[PDB]
Design a protein around this ligand. Structure first.
Ligand SMILES: Nc1ncnc2c1nc(Br)n2[C@@H]1O[C@H](CO)[C@@H](O)[C@H]1O
Ligand SMILES: [Mg+2]
Length: 390
């Protein structure tokens, strides 16, 4: 008769991390990769012998910065001359070249100099997400929904589809990240009547606020706002500067010029930062940090909160701006949705909850997984081919 159909997948193709889910047995499974990670770094590294993707690429970045590519999403569908591209290039250790006013990343790979379009790098990340899904399902996957920021234009959306096609995926649809997060919570399944939904998306490097109106399952993007210079990495930076000062006071030594020491400090700071989302304090223990000096210290959640206080408060400016643009008052928002790992920060949650006069925040779906979750829900809907009964 008719052979069983393979499940379709939902992929959040993120700037820093990507996530893949599948809707089966009436529920979403967010699929861990073979290192046990439910999210995979959107990184690709090139050596004389290998092309590494995901954790393997991010884990060797320290010594291979010129040939480890990340942030390709910031280049996707953009012109080389775009001022965003020109500014971003100053922060990247890898080379970005101009090919007909289209950016390409240029690396050393398998004995040669090779340049790739951003969609080619993203296709490599998509190939890894497809393989992660296939390792769990135990069969080849063909169909996928891929998400993008609501602000992506036609060129950025087409270049994302192109990345999916290069990876051998059939792209069912390109859907907006805030829309996918709303779908994850079933906010399009509440029946008749308008619902105003605010998506609060705090990433590693950027912050996006979106206001959507949902009416009879139909989504309309009412307003987008944000801060391109606000993310998790800025909180890590504040902790780094704090501990550099602390080492200076305690040992009368400036570590800031030993790249390894600074990197080991940043790595420990990011983990201490995550611990502080669940505990009121966190220890920091680094052996032989600088000149054989062991750095054994601690930081309270209160001190971390004070260190990033202005940054956390600044998340409310794009919220107020988006509300003005949507011509809505805060009480008129029915649902608040958290997206991004940085939203696990209790102080960030409290500031936003206080702004919306004590309202509950939807955070029950892991915020770094909600976009893939919604994309997986939609992918299963899009492949249905029910024929009506008489
Ligand atoms: N529990 C957590 N508490 C605070 N921050 C977190 C957490 N989990 C994740 Br994931 N992050 C941060 O999210 C960003 C994703 O690119 C990075 O800055 C991560 O450090
Ligand atoms: Mg995201």
């Amino acid at each position: 008769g008719s052979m069983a159909k393979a499940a379709a997948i939902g992929i959040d193709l993120g700037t820093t991390y990507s996530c893949v889910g599948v809707f089966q047995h009436g529920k979403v499974e967010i699929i861990a990769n073979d290192q046990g990670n439910r999210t995979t770094p959107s990184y690709v590294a090139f050596t004389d012998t290998e092309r590494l993707i995901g954790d393997a690429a991010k884990n060797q970045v320290a010594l291979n910065p010129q040939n480890t590519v990340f942030d390709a999403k910031r280049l996707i569908g953009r012109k080389f001359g775009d001022p965003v591209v020109q500014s971003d290039m100053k922060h990247w250790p890898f080379q970005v070249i101009n090919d007909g006013d289209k950016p390409k990343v240029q690396v050393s790979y398998k004995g040669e100099t090779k340049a790739f379009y951003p969609e080619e790098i993203s296709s490599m990340v998509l190939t890894k997400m497809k393989e992660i899904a296939e390792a769990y399902l135990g069969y080849p996957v063909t169909n996928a929904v891929i998400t993008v920021p609501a602000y992506f234009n036609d060129s950025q959306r087409q270049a994302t589809k192109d990345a999916g096609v290069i990876a051998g995926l059939n792209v069912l649809r390109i859907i907006n990240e805030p829309t996918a997060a709303a779908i994850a919570y079933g906010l399009d399944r509440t029946g008749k009547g308008e619902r105003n939904v605010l998506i609060f998306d705090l990433g590693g490097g950027t912050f996006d606020v979106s206001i959507l109106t949902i009416d009879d399952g139909i989504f309309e993007v009412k307003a987008t706002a944000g801060d391109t210079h606000l993310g998790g990495e800025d909180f890590d930076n504040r902790l780094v500067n704090h501990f550099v000062e602390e080492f200076k006071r305690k040992h009368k030594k400036d570590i800031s010029q030993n790249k390894r020491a600074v990197r080991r400090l940043r790595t420990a700071c990011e983990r201490a930062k995550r611990t502080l989302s669940s505990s009121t304090q966190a220890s920091l223990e680094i052996d032989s940090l600088f000149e054989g000096i062991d750095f054994y210290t601690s930081i309270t959640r209160a001190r971390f909160e004070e260190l990033c206080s202005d940054l956390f408060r600044s998340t409310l400016e794009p919220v107020e701006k988006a509300l003005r643009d949507a011509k809505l008052d805060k009480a008129q928002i029915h649902d608040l949705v958290l997206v991004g790992g940085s939203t696990r920060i209790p102080k960030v949650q409290k500031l936003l909850q206080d702004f919306f006069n004590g309202r509950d925040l939807n955070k029950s779906i892991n915020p770094d997984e909600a976009v893939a979750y919604g994309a997986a829900v939609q992918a299963a809907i899009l492949i249905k081919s029910t024929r009506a009964a008489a």
